[PDB]
Design a protein around this motif. Structure first.
Motif, PDB file in Angstrom:
ATOM      1  N   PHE B 120       0.830  -1.195   0.000  1.00 20.35           N
ATOM      2  CA  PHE B 120       0.000   0.000   0.000  1.00 20.35           C
ATOM      3  C   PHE B 120       0.863   1.243   0.000  1.00 20.35           C
ATOM      4  O   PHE B 120       1.782   1.357   0.796  1.00 20.35           O
ATOM      5  CB  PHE B 120      -0.947   0.026   1.208  1.00 20.35           C
ATOM      6  CG  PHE B 120      -2.000   1.087   1.106  1.00 20.35           C
ATOM      7  CD1 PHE B 120      -3.035   0.963   0.180  1.00 20.35           C
ATOM      8  CD2 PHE B 120      -1.956   2.213   1.914  1.00 20.35           C
ATOM      9  CE1 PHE B 120      -4.005   1.940   0.064  1.00 20.35           C
ATOM     10  CE2 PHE B 120      -2.927   3.205   1.806  1.00 20.35           C
ATOM     11  CZ  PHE B 120      -3.952   3.071   0.869  1.00 20.35           C
ATOM     12  N   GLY B 121       0.538   2.184  -0.881  1.00 18.96           N
ATOM     13  CA  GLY B 121       1.322   3.397  -1.032  1.00 18.96           C
ATOM     14  C   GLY B 121       2.593   3.155  -1.831  1.00 18.96           C
ATOM     15  O   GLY B 121       2.699   2.176  -2.591  1.00 18.96           O
ATOM     16  N   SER B 122       3.549   4.066  -1.663  1.00 16.53           N
ATOM     17  CA  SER B 122       4.810   4.036  -2.385  1.00 16.53           C
ATOM     18  C   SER B 122       5.756   3.083  -1.677  1.00 16.53           C
ATOM     19  O   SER B 122       5.791   3.050  -0.461  1.00 16.53           O
ATOM     20  CB  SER B 122       5.424   5.436  -2.420  1.00 16.53           C
ATOM     21  OG  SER B 122       4.585   6.359  -3.080  1.00 16.53           O
ATOM     22  N   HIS B 142       8.978   0.726   2.411  1.00 18.33           N
ATOM     23  CA  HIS B 142       8.011   1.771   2.154  1.00 18.33           C
ATOM     24  C   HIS B 142       8.751   3.055   1.839  1.00 18.33           C
ATOM     25  O   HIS B 142       9.821   3.314   2.389  1.00 18.33           O
ATOM     26  CB  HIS B 142       7.148   1.950   3.395  1.00 18.33           C
ATOM     27  CG  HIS B 142       5.864   2.662   3.139  1.00 18.33           C
ATOM     28  ND1 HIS B 142       4.884   2.154   2.317  1.00 18.33           N
ATOM     29  CD2 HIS B 142       5.388   3.838   3.608  1.00 18.33           C
ATOM     30  CE1 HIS B 142       3.858   2.985   2.293  1.00 18.33           C
ATOM     31  NE2 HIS B 142       4.138   4.014   3.069  1.00 18.33           N
ATOM     32  N   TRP B 162       6.418   2.261  -6.505  1.00 18.38           N
ATOM     33  CA  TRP B 162       5.912   3.621  -6.610  1.00 18.38           C
ATOM     34  C   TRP B 162       5.099   3.707  -7.891  1.00 18.38           C
ATOM     35  O   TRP B 162       5.446   3.079  -8.905  1.00 18.38           O
ATOM     36  CB  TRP B 162       7.044   4.649  -6.691  1.00 18.38           C
ATOM     37  CG  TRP B 162       7.732   4.964  -5.423  1.00 18.38           C
ATOM     38  CD1 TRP B 162       8.353   4.087  -4.581  1.00 18.38           C
ATOM     39  CD2 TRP B 162       7.926   6.269  -4.854  1.00 18.38           C
ATOM     40  NE1 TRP B 162       8.911   4.765  -3.523  1.00 18.38           N
ATOM     41  CE2 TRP B 162       8.673   6.105  -3.668  1.00 18.38           C
ATOM     42  CE3 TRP B 162       7.539   7.561  -5.224  1.00 18.38           C
ATOM     43  CZ2 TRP B 162       9.029   7.184  -2.843  1.00 18.38           C
ATOM     44  CZ3 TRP B 162       7.895   8.629  -4.409  1.00 18.38           C
ATOM     45  CH2 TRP B 162       8.622   8.429  -3.229  1.00 18.38           C
TER      46      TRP B 162
END
Ligand SMILES: [Fe+2]
Ligand SMILES: [Fe+2]
Ligand SMILES: [Mg+2]
Lengths: 194, 194
Positions: B120-122, B142, B162
């Motif tokens: 989840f996320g970059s 992360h 990313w």
């Protein structure tokens, strides 16, 4: 089951002001609706969730389930923060409160811009009202971070700075995307949140 | 001043295998080189930085300066982790170490895929070696997180997750992008890192 409201201004509503039908369509249909789909699946296998609202989930749950509900709330707030007839400087009570907390609009705008452009990785730039003091503050969240977990911080405005929010139209140029955000800020919505 | 090596296989080297000239050019010229430009700017402000290696900065600094050096390393490692004549299933030493650690290539592939797609996320998906036991592990970081900050951990392979790494060619479909990664994995480089 969970659903989200339609875009307030339609898929192509911001195109003339620099957020294209295609950028908006991917962002809404793939990312935003995708979170809704995933949360609905999660509620089938986590019965506790079927009776909680989006906000209840954000306040009481954590991990992947939090991320889905929070992303749903943040995206809806993001579309409501933009308007084809927005932009420029606020007047009235919003102007008054910004001037009182930041000194001027120009100083507020500089602080929000630098936070929005400087946020490393995926995130969200916010204007909030801290109801502990009445003072307005610029605030950032990381990933699916949501101001609702800090209940004193009433959300007024957000700008999504996840790369998917701007990469279609702006590629790496988040600074240009944020300049565009300023041209579409919905001060009417900000006033409603005060 | 700080620099980065060229792409090992050229701007259009991976186009036939699913990472286009445009996708790779933006990623290398704007993001990767962007980090180098920013680090060199920081080094003019702080001369103590200028004599440190990328890896030294990763091990000793925190905050924005760390993010720059770690991203510089992670991206070079990422380009070295891919090759137009790569992909498929490894043989020899690398195959033996993967089989001994995960049971089989299929089990390793499933674990790495799910970590990479699910992050989840970059972030970044990695294969690393624990240098205490010799055992290989799937490991995620992360944002700019780098395995070099952890004790007794050697990086073997990475896939950048990313959104800028895949949004030009794949948009929201990270799963499709990771399938493409599998078709270009540079097992020769992994062998050199064992
Ligand atoms: Fe988004
Ligand atoms: Fe990258
Ligand atoms: Mg609402």
């Amino acid at each position: 089951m969970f659903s989200i409201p339609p875009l307030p201004w339609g898929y192509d509503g911001l195109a003339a002001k620099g957020l294209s039908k295609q950028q908006v369509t991917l962002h809404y249909d793939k990312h935003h609706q995708g979170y809704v789909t995933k949360l609905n699946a999660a509620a089938q296998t986590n019965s506790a969730l079927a009776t909680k609202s989006i906000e209840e989930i954000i306040r009481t749950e954590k991990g992947p389930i939090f991320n889905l509900a929070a992303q749903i709330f943040n995206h809806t707030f993001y579309w409501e923060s933009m308007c084809p007839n927005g932009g420029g400087e606020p007047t009235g009570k919003v102007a008054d409160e910004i001037n009182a907390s930041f000194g001027s609009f120009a100083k507020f705008k500089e602080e929000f811009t630098n936070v929005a452009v400087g946020h490393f990785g995926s995130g969200w730039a916010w204007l909030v009202k801290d109801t502990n003091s009445g003072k307005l503050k610029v605030y950032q969240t990381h990933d699916a971070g949501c101001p609702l977990t800090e209940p004193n911080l009433k959300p007024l405005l957000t700008c999504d700075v996840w790369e998917h929010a701007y990469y279609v139209d702006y590629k790496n140029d988040r600074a240009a995307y944020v300049q565009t955000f300023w041209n579409v800020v919905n001060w009417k919505n900000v006033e409603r949140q005060l």
